[PDB]
Symmetry: C6
Subunit: 65 residues, 6 copies
Protein backbone atom coordinates (compact mmCIF):
# COMPACT_ATOMS: atom_id res chain seq x y z
CA UNK A 1 0.00 0.00 0.00
CA UNK A 2 0.95 3.64 0.52
CA UNK A 3 -0.61 6.96 1.50
CA UNK A 4 1.12 9.57 -0.64
CA UNK A 5 -1.30 12.49 -0.72
CA UNK A 6 -3.24 14.47 1.85
CA UNK A 7 -5.94 16.34 -0.08
CA UNK A 8 -7.93 16.65 3.16
CA UNK A 9 -5.20 18.97 4.41
CA UNK A 10 -5.64 22.01 2.13
CA UNK A 11 -6.39 24.99 4.38
CA UNK A 12 -5.22 23.51 7.68
CA UNK A 13 -2.33 24.81 9.78
CA UNK A 14 1.17 23.36 9.55
CA UNK A 15 0.77 22.24 13.19
CA UNK A 16 -2.44 20.36 12.42
CA UNK A 17 -0.99 19.00 9.14
CA UNK A 18 2.22 17.65 10.74
CA UNK A 19 0.17 15.72 13.28
CA UNK A 20 -1.91 13.99 10.58
CA UNK A 21 0.96 13.17 8.25
CA UNK A 22 3.04 11.72 11.09
CA UNK A 23 0.03 9.61 12.05
CA UNK A 24 -0.11 8.13 8.54
CA UNK A 25 3.62 8.21 7.75
CA UNK A 26 5.66 7.92 10.95
CA UNK A 27 8.97 8.19 9.04
CA UNK A 28 8.04 11.35 7.11
CA UNK A 29 10.57 14.17 6.92
CA UNK A 30 8.37 17.30 6.84
CA UNK A 31 9.58 20.27 4.78
CA UNK A 32 7.74 23.62 4.88
CA UNK A 33 8.06 25.93 1.85
CA UNK A 34 6.22 29.02 0.61
CA UNK A 35 3.91 28.50 -2.42
CA UNK A 36 5.73 29.30 -5.68
CA UNK A 37 9.06 27.73 -4.62
CA UNK A 38 11.02 25.87 -7.30
CA UNK A 39 12.49 22.65 -5.89
CA UNK A 40 15.21 20.27 -7.11
CA UNK A 41 13.90 17.41 -9.28
CA UNK A 42 15.01 14.77 -6.73
CA UNK A 43 12.48 12.16 -5.53
CA UNK A 44 12.50 11.12 -1.84
CA UNK A 45 10.02 8.57 -0.51
CA UNK A 46 10.30 9.67 3.16
CA UNK A 47 9.79 13.35 2.45
CA UNK A 48 6.63 15.44 2.71
CA UNK A 49 6.77 19.05 1.48
CA UNK A 50 4.09 21.43 2.79
CA UNK A 51 3.45 24.47 0.53
CA UNK A 52 2.21 27.29 2.76
CA UNK A 53 0.47 30.64 2.37
CA UNK A 54 1.22 33.92 4.19
CA UNK A 55 -0.50 32.65 7.34
CA UNK A 56 1.18 29.23 7.27
CA UNK A 57 -1.90 27.28 6.09
CA UNK A 58 -1.54 24.41 3.60
CA UNK A 59 -2.22 25.92 0.18
CA UNK A 60 -1.84 22.82 -2.01
CA UNK A 61 -2.35 19.08 -1.50
CA UNK A 62 0.62 17.65 0.40
CA UNK A 63 2.34 14.73 -1.37
CA UNK A 64 5.33 12.41 -0.91
CA UNK A 65 8.54 13.14 -2.82
Amino acid sequence: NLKTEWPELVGKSVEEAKKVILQDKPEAQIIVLPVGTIVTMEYRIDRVRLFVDKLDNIAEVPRVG
Copy 2:
Protein backbone atom coordinates in the same frame (compact mmCIF):
# COMPACT_ATOMS: atom_id res chain seq x y z
CA ASN B 1 -26.06 27.56 -8.78
CA LEU B 2 -22.70 28.76 -7.48
CA LYS B 3 -20.97 31.94 -6.32
CA THR B 4 -17.41 31.69 -7.58
CA GLU B 5 -16.18 35.28 -7.70
CA TRP B 6 -16.17 38.21 -5.31
CA PRO B 7 -15.49 41.30 -7.43
CA GLU B 8 -17.04 43.43 -4.68
CA LEU B 9 -14.06 42.50 -2.52
CA VAL B 10 -11.20 44.29 -4.31
CA GLY B 11 -9.67 46.73 -1.82
CA LYS B 12 -11.14 45.26 1.37
CA SER B 13 -9.14 43.73 4.22
CA VAL B 14 -8.54 40.00 4.50
CA GLU B 15 -10.58 40.07 7.74
CA GLU B 16 -13.55 41.68 6.01
CA ALA B 17 -13.12 39.44 2.93
CA LYS B 18 -13.04 36.16 4.94
CA LYS B 19 -16.30 37.09 6.63
CA VAL B 20 -18.10 37.66 3.31
CA ILE B 21 -16.76 34.59 1.54
CA LEU B 22 -17.63 32.32 4.48
CA GLN B 23 -21.12 33.81 4.42
CA ASP B 24 -21.53 32.81 0.76
CA LYS B 25 -19.40 29.65 0.81
CA PRO B 26 -19.42 28.08 4.28
CA GLU B 27 -17.05 25.27 3.18
CA ALA B 28 -14.42 27.57 1.65
CA GLN B 29 -10.78 26.94 2.46
CA ILE B 30 -9.26 30.45 2.43
CA ILE B 31 -5.68 30.84 1.20
CA VAL B 32 -3.85 34.18 1.45
CA LEU B 33 -1.02 34.86 -1.02
CA PRO B 34 0.94 37.96 -2.10
CA VAL B 35 0.11 39.32 -5.60
CA GLY B 36 2.50 37.93 -8.21
CA THR B 37 2.60 34.39 -6.74
CA ILE B 38 2.72 31.49 -9.21
CA VAL B 39 0.44 28.67 -8.08
CA THR B 40 0.13 25.00 -9.06
CA MET B 41 -2.35 24.35 -11.90
CA GLU B 42 -4.61 22.25 -9.64
CA TYR B 43 -8.34 23.09 -9.45
CA ARG B 44 -10.13 22.86 -6.07
CA ILE B 45 -13.81 23.70 -5.73
CA ASP B 46 -13.69 24.40 -1.96
CA ARG B 47 -10.72 26.73 -2.14
CA VAL B 48 -10.64 30.53 -2.22
CA ARG B 49 -7.27 32.22 -2.79
CA LEU B 50 -6.96 35.88 -1.70
CA PHE B 51 -4.20 37.83 -3.51
CA VAL B 52 -3.05 40.59 -1.17
CA ASP B 53 -1.05 43.81 -1.36
CA LYS B 54 1.58 45.11 1.09
CA LEU B 55 -1.12 46.17 3.55
CA ASP B 56 -3.09 42.92 3.28
CA ASN B 57 -5.95 44.35 1.17
CA ILE B 58 -7.53 42.27 -1.63
CA ALA B 59 -5.75 43.33 -4.82
CA GLU B 60 -7.58 41.14 -7.36
CA VAL B 61 -11.06 39.62 -7.59
CA PRO B 62 -11.23 36.53 -5.36
CA ARG B 63 -12.34 33.36 -7.18
CA VAL B 64 -12.88 29.65 -6.49
CA GLY B 65 -10.19 27.17 -7.52
Copy 3:
Protein backbone atom coordinates in the same frame (compact mmCIF):
# COMPACT_ATOMS: atom_id res chain seq x y z
CA ASN C 1 -14.08 63.37 -18.25
CA LEU C 2 -11.73 61.32 -16.08
CA LYS C 3 -8.52 61.68 -14.08
CA THR C 4 -6.62 58.44 -14.58
CA GLU C 5 -3.01 59.32 -13.84
CA TRP C 6 -1.18 61.11 -11.05
CA PRO C 7 2.26 61.99 -12.45
CA GLU C 8 2.55 64.69 -9.78
CA LEU C 9 2.73 61.90 -7.21
CA VAL C 10 6.09 60.29 -8.03
CA GLY C 11 8.25 60.55 -4.91
CA LYS C 12 5.50 61.29 -2.39
CA SER C 13 4.51 59.06 0.53
CA VAL C 14 1.65 56.58 0.31
CA GLU C 15 -0.12 58.64 3.01
CA GLU C 16 0.16 61.83 0.97
CA ALA C 17 -0.71 59.98 -2.27
CA LYS C 18 -3.89 58.34 -0.85
CA LYS C 19 -5.18 61.74 0.23
CA VAL C 20 -4.77 63.24 -3.25
CA ILE C 21 -6.20 60.30 -5.18
CA LEU C 22 -9.25 60.09 -2.90
CA GLN C 23 -9.75 63.82 -3.46
CA ASP C 24 -9.86 63.28 -7.24
CA LYS C 25 -11.42 59.80 -7.25
CA PRO C 26 -13.61 59.31 -4.18
CA GLU C 27 -14.48 55.71 -5.19
CA ALA C 28 -10.87 54.59 -5.73
CA GLN C 29 -9.77 51.27 -4.27
CA ILE C 30 -6.09 51.88 -3.40
CA ILE C 31 -3.67 48.96 -3.77
CA VAL C 32 -0.05 49.25 -2.59
CA LEU C 33 2.56 47.00 -4.25
CA PRO C 34 6.37 46.92 -4.37
CA VAL C 35 7.97 48.02 -7.69
CA GLY C 36 8.67 45.02 -9.93
CA THR C 37 5.42 43.17 -9.07
CA ILE C 38 3.70 41.29 -11.90
CA VAL C 39 -0.07 41.80 -11.76
CA THR C 40 -3.01 39.99 -13.38
CA MET C 41 -4.07 41.47 -16.74
CA GLU C 42 -7.52 42.45 -15.39
CA TYR C 43 -8.74 46.05 -15.87
CA ARG C 44 -10.67 47.74 -13.02
CA ILE C 45 -11.91 51.31 -13.34
CA ASP C 46 -12.22 51.94 -9.57
CA ARG C 47 -8.75 50.68 -8.73
CA VAL C 48 -5.54 52.64 -8.16
CA ARG C 49 -2.31 50.67 -7.71
CA LEU C 50 0.59 52.47 -6.00
CA PHE C 51 4.05 51.03 -6.84
CA VAL C 52 6.32 51.76 -3.89
CA ASP C 53 10.04 51.79 -3.11
CA LYS C 54 11.81 50.51 0.02
CA LEU C 55 10.72 53.58 1.98
CA ASP C 56 7.11 53.46 0.77
CA ASN C 57 7.39 56.43 -1.64
CA ILE C 58 5.59 56.38 -5.01
CA ALA C 59 8.16 55.15 -7.53
CA GLU C 60 6.07 55.28 -10.72
CA VAL C 61 3.12 57.36 -11.94
CA PRO C 62 -0.08 56.06 -10.33
CA ARG C 63 -2.81 55.12 -12.84
CA VAL C 64 -6.33 53.65 -12.90
CA GLY C 65 -6.77 49.97 -13.73
Copy 4:
Protein backbone atom coordinates in the same frame (compact mmCIF):
# COMPACT_ATOMS: atom_id res chain seq x y z
CA ASN D 1 23.96 71.62 -18.94
CA LEU D 2 22.89 68.75 -16.69
CA LYS D 3 24.30 66.45 -14.02
CA THR D 4 22.69 63.07 -14.63
CA GLU D 5 25.05 60.58 -13.00
CA TRP D 6 26.73 60.26 -9.64
CA PRO D 7 29.54 57.72 -10.10
CA GLU D 8 31.25 59.17 -7.03
CA LEU D 9 28.39 57.77 -4.98
CA VAL D 10 28.94 54.00 -5.32
CA GLY D 11 29.45 52.62 -1.81
CA LYS D 12 28.05 55.57 0.16
CA SER D 13 24.98 55.48 2.39
CA VAL D 14 21.54 56.53 1.17
CA GLU D 15 21.68 59.38 3.73
CA GLU D 16 24.98 60.66 2.35
CA ALA D 17 23.82 60.09 -1.26
CA LYS D 18 20.52 62.01 -0.84
CA LYS D 19 22.41 65.02 0.48
CA VAL D 20 24.74 65.15 -2.54
CA ILE D 21 22.08 64.59 -5.18
CA LEU D 22 19.81 67.25 -3.67
CA GLN D 23 22.78 69.62 -3.70
CA ASP D 24 23.23 69.07 -7.45
CA LYS D 25 19.57 68.51 -8.37
CA PRO D 26 17.29 70.37 -5.95
CA GLU D 27 14.13 69.08 -7.70
CA ALA D 28 15.15 65.40 -7.64
CA GLN D 29 12.58 62.83 -6.55
CA ILE D 30 14.71 60.16 -4.83
CA ILE D 31 13.60 56.53 -5.15
CA VAL D 32 15.35 53.75 -3.19
CA LEU D 33 15.22 50.21 -4.61
CA PRO D 34 17.09 46.95 -3.92
CA VAL D 35 19.63 45.89 -6.60
CA GLY D 36 18.06 43.48 -9.10
CA THR D 37 14.69 45.30 -9.27
CA ILE D 38 12.99 45.47 -12.67
CA VAL D 39 11.48 48.92 -13.25
CA THR D 40 8.92 50.27 -15.73
CA MET D 41 10.46 51.63 -18.96
CA GLU D 42 9.21 55.18 -18.23
CA TYR D 43 11.69 58.08 -18.35
CA ARG D 44 11.41 60.88 -15.75
CA ILE D 45 13.83 63.80 -15.73
CA ASP D 46 13.24 64.75 -12.06
CA ARG D 47 13.72 61.25 -10.72
CA VAL D 48 16.81 59.66 -9.17
CA ARG D 49 16.68 55.93 -8.38
CA LEU D 50 19.20 54.62 -5.82
CA PHE D 51 19.95 50.87 -6.12
CA VAL D 52 20.95 49.64 -2.67
CA ASP D 53 22.64 46.60 -1.14
CA LYS D 54 21.68 44.72 2.05
CA LEU D 55 23.18 47.47 4.21
CA ASP D 56 21.58 50.32 2.26
CA ASN D 57 24.79 51.45 0.49
CA ILE D 58 24.69 52.62 -3.15
CA ALA D 59 25.60 49.57 -5.23
CA GLU D 60 25.45 51.09 -8.73
CA VAL D 61 26.01 54.56 -10.19
CA PRO D 62 22.93 56.70 -9.54
CA ARG D 63 21.41 58.25 -12.69
CA VAL D 64 18.45 60.41 -13.73
CA GLY D 65 15.39 58.73 -15.23
Copy 5:
Protein backbone atom coordinates in the same frame (compact mmCIF):
# COMPACT_ATOMS: atom_id res chain seq x y z
CA ASN E 1 38.04 8.25 -0.69
CA LEU E 2 35.57 11.08 -0.09
CA LYS E 3 32.21 11.73 1.56
CA THR E 4 30.43 14.20 -0.69
CA GLU E 5 26.75 13.75 0.11
CA TRP E 6 24.68 13.63 3.27
CA PRO E 7 21.34 12.07 2.26
CA GLU E 8 20.77 11.13 5.91
CA LEU E 9 20.46 14.84 6.65
CA VAL E 10 17.20 15.73 4.85
CA GLY E 11 14.80 17.07 7.48
CA LYS E 12 17.34 17.79 10.23
CA SER E 13 18.14 21.23 11.64
CA VAL E 14 21.06 23.31 10.40
CA GLU E 15 22.57 22.97 13.91
CA GLU E 16 22.38 19.18 13.80
CA ALA E 17 23.54 19.11 10.14
CA LYS E 18 26.63 21.32 10.76
CA LYS E 19 27.76 19.00 13.53
CA VAL E 20 27.59 15.90 11.30
CA ILE E 21 29.23 17.46 8.25
CA LEU E 22 32.10 18.87 10.33
CA GLN E 23 32.56 15.41 11.81
CA ASP E 24 32.98 13.92 8.32
CA LYS E 25 34.61 16.93 6.64
CA PRO E 26 36.56 18.98 9.18
CA GLU E 27 37.58 21.56 6.53
CA ALA E 28 34.05 22.16 5.20
CA GLN E 29 32.92 25.73 4.65
CA ILE E 30 29.17 25.58 5.41
CA ILE E 31 26.85 27.83 3.41
CA VAL E 32 23.14 28.12 4.28
CA LEU E 33 20.72 29.13 1.50
CA PRO E 34 16.93 29.06 1.06
CA VAL E 35 15.58 26.37 -1.33
CA GLY E 36 15.12 27.77 -4.85
CA THR E 37 18.33 29.86 -4.82
CA ILE E 38 20.30 30.05 -8.07
CA VAL E 39 24.04 29.77 -7.39
CA THR E 40 27.14 30.54 -9.47
CA MET E 41 28.43 27.57 -11.49
CA GLU E 42 31.73 27.49 -9.56
CA TYR E 43 32.91 24.20 -8.02
CA ARG E 44 34.58 24.26 -4.57
CA ILE E 45 35.76 21.07 -2.90
CA ASP E 46 35.76 22.48 0.66
CA ARG E 47 32.27 23.92 0.46
CA VAL E 48 28.98 22.46 1.70
CA ARG E 49 25.77 24.31 0.82
CA LEU E 50 22.70 23.59 2.98
CA PHE E 51 19.35 24.31 1.25
CA VAL E 52 16.84 25.16 3.97
CA ASP E 53 13.07 25.45 4.35
CA LYS E 54 11.09 28.13 6.22
CA LEU E 55 11.96 26.54 9.57
CA ASP E 56 15.65 26.09 8.76
CA ASN E 57 15.49 22.30 8.22
CA ILE E 58 17.56 20.64 5.45
CA ALA E 59 15.22 20.34 2.47
CA GLU E 60 17.55 18.63 -0.02
CA VAL E 61 20.54 16.28 0.24
CA PRO E 62 23.63 18.29 1.19
CA ARG E 63 26.57 17.86 -1.22
CA VAL E 64 30.11 19.17 -1.75
CA GLY E 65 30.70 21.90 -4.33
Copy 6:
Protein backbone atom coordinates in the same frame (compact mmCIF):
# COMPACT_ATOMS: atom_id res chain seq x y z
CA ASN F 1 50.02 44.06 -10.16
CA LEU F 2 46.54 43.63 -8.69
CA LYS F 3 44.67 41.47 -6.20
CA THR F 4 41.22 40.95 -7.68
CA GLU F 5 39.93 37.80 -6.03
CA TRP F 6 39.66 36.53 -2.48
CA PRO F 7 39.08 32.77 -2.75
CA GLU F 8 40.37 32.39 0.82
CA LEU F 9 37.25 34.24 1.95
CA VAL F 10 34.49 31.72 1.13
CA GLY F 11 32.72 30.89 4.39
CA LYS F 12 33.97 33.82 6.46
CA SER F 13 31.79 36.56 7.95
CA VAL F 14 31.25 39.89 6.21
CA GLU F 15 33.03 41.54 9.17
CA GLU F 16 36.09 39.33 8.76
CA ALA F 17 35.95 39.66 4.95
CA LYS F 18 35.78 43.50 4.96
CA LYS F 19 38.89 43.65 7.13
CA VAL F 20 40.92 41.48 4.74
CA ILE F 21 39.79 43.17 1.54
CA LEU F 22 40.48 46.64 2.95
CA GLN F 23 43.93 45.42 3.93
CA ASP F 24 44.65 44.39 0.33
CA LYS F 25 42.59 47.08 -1.43
CA PRO F 26 42.38 50.21 0.72
CA GLU F 27 40.16 52.00 -1.84
CA ALA F 28 37.61 49.18 -2.18
CA GLN F 29 33.93 50.06 -2.09
CA ILE F 30 32.34 47.01 -0.42
CA ILE F 31 28.86 45.96 -1.56
CA VAL F 32 26.95 43.19 0.24
CA LEU F 33 24.30 41.27 -1.73
CA PRO F 34 22.37 38.02 -1.21
CA VAL F 35 23.44 35.06 -3.42
CA GLY F 36 21.29 34.85 -6.56
CA THR F 37 21.15 38.64 -7.15
CA ILE F 38 21.29 39.84 -10.75
CA VAL F 39 23.54 42.90 -11.07
CA THR F 40 24.00 45.54 -13.78
CA MET F 41 26.70 44.68 -16.33
CA GLU F 42 28.83 47.70 -15.31
CA TYR F 43 32.52 47.16 -14.43
CA ARG F 44 34.03 49.14 -11.52
CA ILE F 45 37.66 48.68 -10.51
CA ASP F 46 37.23 50.02 -6.95
CA ARG F 47 34.24 47.87 -6.13
CA VAL F 48 34.07 44.57 -4.24
CA ARG F 49 30.72 42.75 -4.11
CA LEU F 50 30.25 40.18 -1.33
CA PHE F 51 27.60 37.51 -2.08
CA VAL F 52 26.21 36.33 1.25
CA ASP F 53 24.16 33.43 2.60
CA LYS F 54 21.32 33.53 5.15
CA LEU F 55 23.80 33.95 8.00
CA ASP F 56 25.85 36.64 6.25
CA ASN F 57 28.84 34.38 5.41
CA ILE F 58 30.67 34.75 2.08
CA ALA F 59 29.13 32.16 -0.24
CA GLU F 60 31.20 32.77 -3.38
CA VAL F 61 34.72 34.02 -4.10
CA PRO F 62 34.78 37.82 -3.78
CA ARG F 63 36.10 39.62 -6.88
CA VAL F 64 36.67 43.17 -8.16
CA GLY F 65 34.12 44.70 -10.53
